[PDB]
Amino acid sequence: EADRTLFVGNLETKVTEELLFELFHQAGPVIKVKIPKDKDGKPKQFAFVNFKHEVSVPYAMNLLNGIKLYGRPIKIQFR
Amino acid sequence: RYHAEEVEERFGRFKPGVISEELQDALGVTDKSLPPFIYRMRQLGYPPGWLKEAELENSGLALYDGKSVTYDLSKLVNYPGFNISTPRGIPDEWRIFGSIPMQACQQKDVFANYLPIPDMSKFATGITPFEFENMAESTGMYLRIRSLLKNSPRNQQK
Amino acid sequence: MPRVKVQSVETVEGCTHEVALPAEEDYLPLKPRVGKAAKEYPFILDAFQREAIQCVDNNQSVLVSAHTSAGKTVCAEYAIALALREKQRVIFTSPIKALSNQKYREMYEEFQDVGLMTGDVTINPTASCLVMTTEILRSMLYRGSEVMREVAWVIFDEIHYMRDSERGVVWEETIILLPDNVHYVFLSATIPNARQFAEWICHLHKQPCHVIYTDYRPTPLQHYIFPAGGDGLHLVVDENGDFREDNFNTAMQVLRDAGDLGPSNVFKIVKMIMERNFQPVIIFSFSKKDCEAYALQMTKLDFNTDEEKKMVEEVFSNAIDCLSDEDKKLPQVEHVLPLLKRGIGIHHGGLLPILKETIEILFSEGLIKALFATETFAMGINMPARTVLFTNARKFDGKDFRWISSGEYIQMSGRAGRRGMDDRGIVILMVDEKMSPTIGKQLLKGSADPLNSAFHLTYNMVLNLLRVEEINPEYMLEKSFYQFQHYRAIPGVVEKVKNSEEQYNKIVIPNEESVVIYYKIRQQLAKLGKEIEEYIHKPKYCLPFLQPGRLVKVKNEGDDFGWGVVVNFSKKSPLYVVEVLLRCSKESLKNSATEAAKPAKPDEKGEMQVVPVLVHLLSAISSVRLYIPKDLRPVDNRQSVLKSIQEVQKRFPDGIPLLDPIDDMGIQDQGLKKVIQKVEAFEHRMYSHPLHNDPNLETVYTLCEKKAQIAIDIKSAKRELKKARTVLQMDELKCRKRVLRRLGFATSSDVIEMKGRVACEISSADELLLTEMMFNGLFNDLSAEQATALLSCFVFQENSSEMPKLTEQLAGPLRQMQECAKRIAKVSAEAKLEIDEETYLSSFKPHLMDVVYTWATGATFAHICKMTDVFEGSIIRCMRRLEELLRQMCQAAKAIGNTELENKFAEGITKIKRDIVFAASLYL
RNA sequence: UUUAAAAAAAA
């Protein structure tokens, strides 16, 4: 799991599960995105994404890094 | 359960290759402009995530009596502009963000081709005699079913 | 007492034809055929079938026991043809309902003068031939339907099913009650004790009965073993039968090396099969979930050509068209179609019956090339395959988990290898880590299990027998192939006791009085030592002394491992387990996955392994604590420990010192003091005896011990022989009759009262409960829905943990039923009958009460199927059983002349009988 | 620039 996990930080407010899943599924099969919400009811700058295979995790990073989502770069880190 | 194939609805469903207008809005770029990732994507190559999906592994088991891996060529993903020629109306915007024109290796064709006992009357005394129930007749369904597959692999081998 | 002679008729090679006939009779040869043969076959008949046909030509019963697919059914076909040719009537009996349907379809397409009678349906009852499940035949016998008069032949099928332990009794009853003029034909899988069955039939009906036994099979078999972790299949058994020991050992060694160290093994196996051209495969897994998961895993292959896909789509659509369009929208029907399209199918009790029938048809026609099935599919008819695969060799029967018996393995593997099309059947057995070479050898080399009856009394049987006149249950108990086995066994025990007695007399003793006194004193000393040791092993006294270096001797009765060093101890759950370091046998070590332990054989050198013994096995807790290496993993250290023990023994030439139970362990309670006094007195008495100092007393003592052993053996053997001289359940019958009379069913003179007469009808579920509730007026107020739900609660039995909450109408009636059941349990208990009240009450599981209530209300099937977790197959089974029980309840209400209940149950039947649950089988 | 394993079956 930890191998297939990948943290996402500094994501735009409207960035929800559906859009992130759409973005990340095209490169390869992705299990799902986890967004444990704070005491606010809105997506946080912090979240995680779990992919079907860890081999796919780097390529997404190789393809996506601070991409212009909603006119706002989004950073991605490892475990 | 076998029929409980609802795991594919955690939040929705999508398809590979195609680009949704909602995704275009999310990325901040409309459909007229070529996707920026494609640049980097064609500077990276074919994603390995779907490569495993199209790859079938031959079992190595051998009979201890006293690899040319198989790939499903029909499952190849479509990535126009990298593997397939860019659709008309979309110029080769390799000068944006830095990239090169779609290469033959980057193209789909090259990658694809690269690979004593009481009498009976006494018994019926004092108890209701047995009666037939649920009387019915054959509906012929088995006959028609058999007629359908008249020439089956078993039959043709007979 | 039985008196039957078994004449071994000579026969050609391949079969062993022997006839059991009454002792006073004189065997005579079987006359050849007279006139034209009943029916002609297009192929030559193997010898045993020819002998069976000749035997039936003389109107003499026969018991064919041969591997399924050896061609047993030809004998039944010939018998039916002969019976029809003579204007007689015949009955064909099968255990299961679905197997009965398939057999009926075959016969109808054969002769077209066929009927069918089962609980679900009945077709052409007035036919010269009939097919019916055993229960219908038993009902005919008990009620003596006139149709039974015309019969002349009865063909029992799968008679080896008689040991079902739940539905076995229904066979014996049916066999007992038939008139003697009838002639039987029994078809069974190969079993060792067929001769006993033939003798029973002969003794029971006073006529000759033959036995044809043949193990021949048309196409040979090859057995491979796949270890969990290996990378290949080992040819453990070849068609010649020469169990290849070396290959089996290599496979098990690979298993061990992997254990002590294509994501799924089954996927690798099936893929290898596919690429090796063994396409038609049956994968047996003893769990519904396992079959579902394995089928799901394989949703990435395709064994079918496009034309096969079109054909499968056509067949599936045509089969499903019968159901209502709303039914076709069920997830189950929709989601299986892709699997059949790609050539993968599932078959287990959970599925819907219609899907099971469709999959059976497709497999029979070859469209499906890999079928995941449970044990049930094994009993199917004419559905062979070129290969069979076992996922897990562990099944949970009614009792608990266990290794599949060799009989079941043979039965299932018999479904491998078609006739002619493929000339080499392949059977592959997967073995996990929890497997032992001994278990594997026994499973592969084992033979079919013996046929042991399971007769047990039932209130319905007792009531019905009492009702009829000129007969009593004692007759049944006497003749029910259970006293028969004991009678057959009696000569063995008689000869055993006689032989032991003559040998005991043969022994010669110089002067038995003095030797016996000495031996008795010795035994008393042994008992006192046992008491002292029991005193030592109290945990609070010996646990402080079981340090990780202590030197203790462990001696389980009969087998003593010698000295060994303690390593650790713990409280297992409240016994204590002490882990000693003993010398093992290197055989129990290799198959340690299942064996316990064994002392090292004196000839060879053990392995010096850690054994977890029980605390009380410590014969003597010496006091020489060794210096333990502190790391006993490597095998080198433990040999050093063995050398150290040998050195310590060499240092104390006259026995290692033992902890003194009195002062070293500081035991104070006076009981040990008195035991010490007793042992001291006995020791002095023994020493003062003269023969103790005499020479050569060792041999005399040994022979005296052997004489005592033989004496106790004689005592036990004759005691059990006297025990066997009485009918067993007679006490059980007495208890049952007491209970029946105590509730008014039977008068003190054992004549059926109206209550028992009513209870006679109900036979699909409990009778006393239903009759009591009916008489107590419980049902007089419930609407049809509540009655239906309660009856459903009666006929449900499955390991369900849901325990759903019932709101208003399904609770109160359940509580009243609980009260009545408690009353019945208490009455049974006070009548000295073995019954656990809590378990009895726990039997009636109401888990489906709400489901059945909703279904009666008018809910669509999909709605209820989502209302719980039980597989839809179980729901359908329970619904059918409830429907038949409701019909029986209608009959009972008619009997008591209470129109209200009759109308109520009519409403119940009308409401809960509709499209999908009671979907007519497509085999009709 | 990072939250419990569990088969089969009927009047």
Side-chain angles (χ1 to χ4, degrees):
Chain A
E1 180 173 348
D3 55 358
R4 285 171 286 96
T5 63
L6 180 72
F7 172 86
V8 178
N10 306 126
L11 54 91
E12 193 266 10
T13 58
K14 292 210 307 310
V15 177
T16 177
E17 299 188 5
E18 191 71 353
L19 281 62
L20 291 176
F21 177 76
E22 162 54 14
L23 276 156
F24 302 149
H25 196 62
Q26 303 297 327
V30 188
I31 295 293
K32 70 186 186 65
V33 307
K34 291 183 176 181
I35 47 167
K37 61 177 66 176
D38 308 15
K39 56 179 179 61
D40 61 328
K42 290 83 174 182
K44 238 298 293 181
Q45 310 305 337
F46 101 93
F48 293 78
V49 294
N50 304 329
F51 300 76
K52 188 179 293 302
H53 289 73
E54 74 295 349
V55 305
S56 178
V57 170
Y59 193 87
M61 188 74 67
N62 301 125
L63 183 58
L64 309 174
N65 179 18
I67 302 301
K68 194 66 59 52
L69 291 308
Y70 285 129
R72 180 178 178 179
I74 65 184
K75 272 55 63 178
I76 310 183
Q77 333 297 8
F78 288 4
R79 303 96 215 174
Chain B
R1 283 281 289 164
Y2 71 93
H3 66 278
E5 289 293 355
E6 313 307 336
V7 301
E8 302 180 1
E9 295 185 359
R10 307 179 307 281
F11 14 76
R13 187 189 58 75
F14 292 96
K15 297 186 178 183
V18 301
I19 306 299
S20 62
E21 258 294 9
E22 62 88 2
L23 171 55
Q24 297 279 7
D25 160 67
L27 185 56
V29 180
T30 62
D31 320 18
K32 295 185 177 181
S33 301
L34 186 70
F37 81 92
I38 292 289
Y39 305 149
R40 199 186 309 174
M41 204 275 288
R42 69 161 169 271
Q43 196 167 354
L44 291 165
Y46 173 74
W50 300 105
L51 196 167
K52 302 297 184 180
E53 310 307 335
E55 179 171 356
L56 291 67
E57 197 284 341
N58 307 17
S59 301
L61 285 62
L63 303 183
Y64 287 129
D65 164 77
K67 297 181 179 179
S68 59
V69 185
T70 305
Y71 296 77
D72 185 354
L73 302 178
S74 61
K75 290 175 171 175
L76 299 177
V77 186
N78 300 18
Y79 292 147
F82 162 81
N83 79 335
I84 297 169
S85 300
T86 319
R88 293 191 174 185
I90 306 174
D92 177 16
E93 304 160 8
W94 67 266
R95 301 185 183 85
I96 301 178
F97 198 79
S99 173
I100 55 176
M102 187 186 69
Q103 300 181 133
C105 62
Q106 295 173 358
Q107 202 164 9
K108 192 178 190 177
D109 61 79
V110 181
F111 206 91
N113 302 284
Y114 162 82
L115 307 180
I117 191 71
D119 173 72
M120 183 176 60
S121 68
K122 296 181 179 181
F123 276 108
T125 66
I127 187 175
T128 181
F130 169 78
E131 300 178 357
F132 311 101
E133 295 179 347
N134 302 332
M135 181 62 178
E137 284 293 348
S138 171
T139 189
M141 179 149 55
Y142 182 86
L143 284 300
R144 82 203 300 178
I145 289 169
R146 184 176 58 186
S147 75
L148 290 183
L149 75 191
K150 181 171 61 55
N151 57 331
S152 70
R154 173 178 171 275
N155 306 17
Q156 69 190 13
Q157 291 294 357
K158 184 180 292 184
Chain C
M1 273 291 296
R3 46 192 62 84
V4 302
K5 167 175 62 177
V6 169
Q7 166 50 23
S8 175
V9 166
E10 56 75 24
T11 174
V12 301
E13 181 63 9
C15 69
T16 69
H17 174 17
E18 66 178 25
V19 51
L21 76 186
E24 67 279 15
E25 267 194 33
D26 49 356
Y27 162 67
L28 77 180
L30 315 183
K31 303 305 307 310
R33 166 175 293 92
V34 301
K36 175 60 183 61
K39 69 183 294 186
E40 190 64 9
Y41 302 103
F43 56 95
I44 305 304
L45 294 174
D46 38 358
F48 94 88
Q49 293 179 349
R50 299 169 61 177
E51 288 197 358
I53 295 304
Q54 184 175 13
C55 179
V56 59
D57 291 322
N58 310 133
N59 302 74
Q60 303 189 13
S61 303
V62 55
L63 182 156
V64 181
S65 73
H67 287 292
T68 305
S69 74
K72 295 184 298 188
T73 189
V74 72
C75 306
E77 296 174 3
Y78 190 92
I80 293 175
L82 174 61
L84 295 186
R85 187 180 71 178
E86 314 315 324
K87 311 308 302 184
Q88 306 169 4
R89 176 174 295 194
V90 57
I91 286 176
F92 193 109
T93 302
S94 61
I96 311 175
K97 224 177 295 186
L99 180 57
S100 84
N101 287 338
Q102 301 184 20
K103 186 62 59 165
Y104 154 69
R105 171 53 59 180
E106 284 197 3
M107 296 301 171
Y108 175 92
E109 301 304 339
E110 240 299 3
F111 313 108
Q112 295 78 44
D113 185 4
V114 172
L116 175 57
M117 297 181 63
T118 69
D120 301 0
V121 301
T122 62
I123 300 177
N124 185 17
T126 61
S128 51
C129 170
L130 291 173
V131 182
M132 61 186 65
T133 53
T134 55
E135 286 63 327
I136 297 292
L137 177 54
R138 172 176 162 278
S139 177
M140 296 316 87
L141 266 293
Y142 277 151
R143 303 185 182 185
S145 182
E146 186 62 15
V147 300
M148 193 57 53
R149 179 171 302 282
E150 182 61 13
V151 310
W153 285 96
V154 182
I155 302 177
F156 286 84
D157 195 344
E158 298 287 300
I159 195 62
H160 67 248
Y161 214 88
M162 184 174 63
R163 64 188 168 187
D164 174 66
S165 189
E166 179 188 359
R167 293 171 57 261
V169 59
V170 309
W171 269 270
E172 303 182 15
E173 302 181 19
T174 49
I175 299 175
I176 293 163
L177 302 175
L178 288 165
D180 297 81
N181 65 274
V182 78
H183 297 302
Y184 303 75
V185 180
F186 303 96
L187 281 38
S188 96
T190 190
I191 52 182
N193 64 312
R195 186 185 296 90
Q196 278 191 7
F197 196 106
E199 288 184 10
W200 172 41
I201 292 300
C202 155
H203 145 61
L204 176 53
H205 284 270
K206 314 304 181 185
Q207 59 166 359
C209 180
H210 298 191
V211 177
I212 312 301
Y213 180 103
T214 176
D215 187 71
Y216 146 78
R217 46 170 61 268
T219 63
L221 280 291
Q222 296 182 342
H223 308 240
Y224 302 105
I225 291 174
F226 175 76
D231 67 351
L233 312 191
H234 312 69
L235 198 177
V236 294
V237 182
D238 185 84
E239 54 270 31
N240 301 324
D242 50 332
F243 179 88
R244 288 188 176 276
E245 177 60 14
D246 58 358
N247 292 114
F248 177 83
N249 293 124
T250 304
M252 289 300 174
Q253 178 53 23
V254 169
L255 173 55
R256 172 63 67 84
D257 301 5
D260 60 357
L261 194 166
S264 181
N265 292 328
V266 307
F267 192 102
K268 300 191 184 66
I269 298 287
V270 63
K271 184 67 172 58
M272 189 275 292
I273 269 170
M274 178 181 177
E275 62 189 355
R276 293 299 184 89
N277 186 259
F278 306 152
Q279 61 284 137
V281 55
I282 308 182
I283 296 164
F284 285 110
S285 174
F286 306 85
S287 173
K288 319 188 198 309
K289 313 311 301 300
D290 293 7
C291 294
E292 300 283 21
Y294 292 180
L296 270 297
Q297 288 186 13
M298 288 199 70
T299 184
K300 60 193 302 305
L301 303 78
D302 187 330
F303 308 81
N304 293 337
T305 309
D306 299 328
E307 285 64 1
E308 298 184 2
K309 302 179 181 59
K310 315 314 178 186
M311 198 172 295
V312 163
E313 158 51 25
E314 193 71 1
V315 168
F316 196 94
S317 58
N318 185 277
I320 295 299
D321 67 358
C322 69
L323 309 186
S324 83
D325 308 332
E326 289 64 6
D327 318 316
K328 310 179 188 176
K329 298 169 58 55
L330 294 161
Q332 295 77 352
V333 300
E334 298 176 350
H335 294 56
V336 297
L337 179 50
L339 302 173
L340 313 186
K341 291 282 286 186
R342 57 164 40 82
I344 294 175
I346 308 173
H347 192 302
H348 59 53
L351 300 177
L352 293 176
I354 190 168
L355 297 186
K356 292 163 60 179
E357 297 176 351
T358 300
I359 293 171
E360 285 179 16
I361 277 182
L362 296 185
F363 196 108
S364 55
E365 295 297 347
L367 306 197
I368 307 181
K369 297 186 178 61
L371 174 53
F372 299 86
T374 58
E375 57 194 345
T376 182
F377 193 93
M379 302 195 70
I381 171 167
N382 195 333
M383 301 178 192
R386 184 181 296 188
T387 296
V388 173
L389 180 69
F390 297 89
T391 64
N392 177 17
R394 296 290 303 284
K395 63 178 295 188
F396 162 79
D397 55 14
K399 282 67 172 182
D400 46 355
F401 293 75
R402 62 182 185 81
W403 298 99
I404 59 177
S405 55
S406 175
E408 300 174 19
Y409 172 92
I410 293 171
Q411 168 55 19
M412 295 182 177
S413 64
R415 300 276 67 184
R418 288 82 57 78
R419 187 61 166 275
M421 57 184 63
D422 50 4
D423 57 2
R424 189 183 311 283
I426 301 171
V427 61
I428 299 170
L429 170 53
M430 290 172 56
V431 297
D432 61 350
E433 63 185 3
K434 306 184 296 183
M435 186 70 171
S436 54
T438 181
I439 288 286
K441 286 178 57 48
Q442 293 177 14
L443 186 59
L444 273 55
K445 304 179 70 61
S447 182
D449 305 354
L451 205 183
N452 292 342
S453 177
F455 187 85
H456 67 78
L457 284 299
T458 64
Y459 294 80
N460 178 269
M461 182 202 301
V462 175
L463 287 168
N464 289 320
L465 291 181
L466 291 182
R467 175 182 58 84
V468 59
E469 31 179 1
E470 295 77 33
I471 191 169
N472 55 32
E474 293 79 341
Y475 178 89
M476 195 82 69
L477 255 169
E478 295 150 7
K479 291 177 174 303
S480 65
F481 191 62
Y482 189 69
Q483 300 300 157
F484 184 96
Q485 288 188 330
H486 278 46
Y487 298 170
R488 291 269 70 186
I490 278 287
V493 294
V494 171
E495 171 46 36
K496 180 177 178 182
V497 296
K498 168 53 189 174
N499 160 33
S500 296
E501 276 289 8
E502 59 76 22
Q503 183 168 331
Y504 167 99
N505 284 120
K506 163 266 166 185
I507 207 182
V508 63
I509 298 186
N511 37 7
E512 73 172 16
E513 75 301 346
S514 309
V515 182
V516 164
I517 295 297
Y518 187 85
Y519 176 90
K520 177 262 187 177
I521 292 173
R522 180 67 58 79
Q523 290 298 338
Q524 192 62 9
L525 283 177
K527 184 188 299 305
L528 293 185
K530 190 58 51 51
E531 273 96 45
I532 296 170
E533 291 182 12
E534 179 279 309
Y535 244 138
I536 293 172
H537 299 148
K538 296 178 59 50
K540 73 190 303 307
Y541 289 162
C542 84
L543 286 175
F545 285 88
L546 297 179
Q547 299 172 11
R550 186 66 61 179
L551 189 72
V552 312
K553 176 185 292 183
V554 50
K555 160 176 166 57
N556 177 95
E557 51 80 17
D559 50 354
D560 61 339
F561 305 79
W563 295 100
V565 179
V566 175
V567 173
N568 178 337
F569 69 88
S570 54
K571 164 69 95 188
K572 192 265 177 181
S573 301
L575 79 187
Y576 289 99
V577 171
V578 179
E579 317 198 19
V580 288
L581 181 155
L582 312 169
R583 273 185 56 188
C584 301
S585 57
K586 182 53 59 57
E587 297 166 322
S588 298
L589 196 75
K590 91 194 307 308
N591 65 6
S592 64
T594 65
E595 285 291 354
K598 288 296 182 301
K601 294 293 185 176
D603 52 357
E604 51 73 32
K605 58 182 293 186
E607 203 275 347
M608 206 67 181
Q609 191 59 15
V610 176
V611 180
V613 313
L614 238 177
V615 66
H616 69 69
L617 293 184
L618 299 185
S619 180
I621 306 175
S622 169
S623 82
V624 298
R625 179 162 57 77
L626 286 177
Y627 296 135
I628 218 67
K630 190 164 59 58
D631 182 74
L632 297 171
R633 278 189 291 262
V635 65
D636 184 9
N637 293 345
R638 300 175 292 195
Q639 303 305 336
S640 86
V641 164
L642 169 55
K643 267 56 181 175
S644 184
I645 295 171
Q646 287 187 342
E647 294 296 345
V648 167
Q649 280 184 24
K650 288 170 62 179
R651 181 166 263 277
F652 297 77
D654 60 320
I656 302 195
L658 311 185
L659 279 176
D660 206 329
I662 317 177
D663 55 4
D664 283 324
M665 304 197 179
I667 303 180
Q668 295 298 345
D669 48 6
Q670 188 67 1
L672 174 52
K673 302 287 187 176
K674 305 311 303 184
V675 173
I676 288 284
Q677 296 292 350
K678 299 301 100 171
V679 61
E680 180 63 7
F682 277 106
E683 291 160 341
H684 194 359
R685 181 186 295 94
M686 152 176 175
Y687 284 115
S688 298
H689 226 198
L691 77 178
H692 185 357
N693 86 323
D694 294 6
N696 194 9
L697 68 78
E698 178 57 20
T699 190
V700 180
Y701 170 88
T702 53
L703 65 76
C704 186
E705 160 275 4
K706 98 191 293 299
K707 172 171 186 178
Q709 177 57 224
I710 294 177
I712 62 171
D713 301 2
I714 288 170
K715 187 61 165 294
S716 67
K718 66 199 306 180
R719 179 174 57 83
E720 61 78 16
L721 169 154
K722 177 50 57 58
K723 166 266 289 182
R725 282 199 172 187
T726 168
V727 287
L728 295 79
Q729 293 83 342
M730 184 56 59
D731 53 356
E732 182 64 9
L733 177 53
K734 289 290 103 184
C735 305
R736 296 284 168 78
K737 297 166 75 168
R738 288 182 210 169
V739 172
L740 292 173
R741 64 168 50 86
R742 176 150 296 181
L743 305 185
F745 290 107
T747 317
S748 63
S749 65
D750 300 350
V751 53
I752 294 303
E753 188 50 290
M754 177 169 59
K755 219 173 193 177
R757 195 182 308 168
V758 171
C760 293
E761 279 61 358
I762 299 174
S763 59
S764 62
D766 179 302
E767 317 77 334
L768 307 169
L769 271 292
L770 274 291
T771 55
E772 277 291 4
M773 269 165 281
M774 210 174 184
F775 274 93
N776 294 25
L778 173 53
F779 292 107
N780 60 11
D781 291 337
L782 285 63
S783 182
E785 292 69 317
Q786 308 94 9
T788 52
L790 178 58
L791 296 169
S792 82
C793 176
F794 277 96
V795 309
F796 176 86
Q797 42 181 328
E798 185 277 352
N799 171 261
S800 52
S801 301
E802 164 49 29
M803 278 262 57
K805 67 181 297 306
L806 286 35
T807 64
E808 168 49 26
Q809 303 73 219
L810 286 55
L814 176 51
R815 286 188 291 89
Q816 305 203 39
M817 191 282 285
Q818 290 285 7
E819 292 181 357
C820 191
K822 285 189 297 183
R823 164 169 61 268
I824 290 296
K826 168 260 287 183
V827 171
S828 53
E830 78 173 20
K832 298 192 300 304
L833 174 56
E834 204 296 327
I835 182 61
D836 182 354
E837 181 270 7
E838 169 49 29
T839 65
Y840 181 88
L841 275 305
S842 72
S843 66
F844 305 164
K845 276 169 285 300
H847 292 56
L848 288 177
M849 198 174 288
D850 54 0
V851 171
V852 171
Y853 180 88
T854 54
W855 171 263
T857 49
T860 184
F861 176 89
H863 176 13
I864 60 168
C865 182
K866 181 168 60 177
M867 185 169 295
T868 174
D869 62 328
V870 296
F871 299 88
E872 58 280 15
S874 300
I875 298 171
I876 299 303
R877 184 185 306 281
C878 172
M879 197 65 59
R880 297 167 176 269
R881 199 162 174 77
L882 169 59
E883 177 277 351
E884 73 170 358
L885 172 57
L886 255 172
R887 283 187 298 90
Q888 283 174 329
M889 214 63 55
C890 289
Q891 195 57 212
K894 173 57 170 294
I896 56 168
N898 179 5
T899 64
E900 181 188 9
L901 293 174
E902 304 176 36
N903 305 334
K904 192 185 302 309
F905 296 135
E907 297 289 333
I909 280 285
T910 54
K911 289 186 181 304
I912 75 183
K913 191 175 186 296
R914 57 203 182 205
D915 53 3
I916 174 53
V917 281
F918 303 94
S921 169
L922 59 83
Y923 266 112
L924 308 177

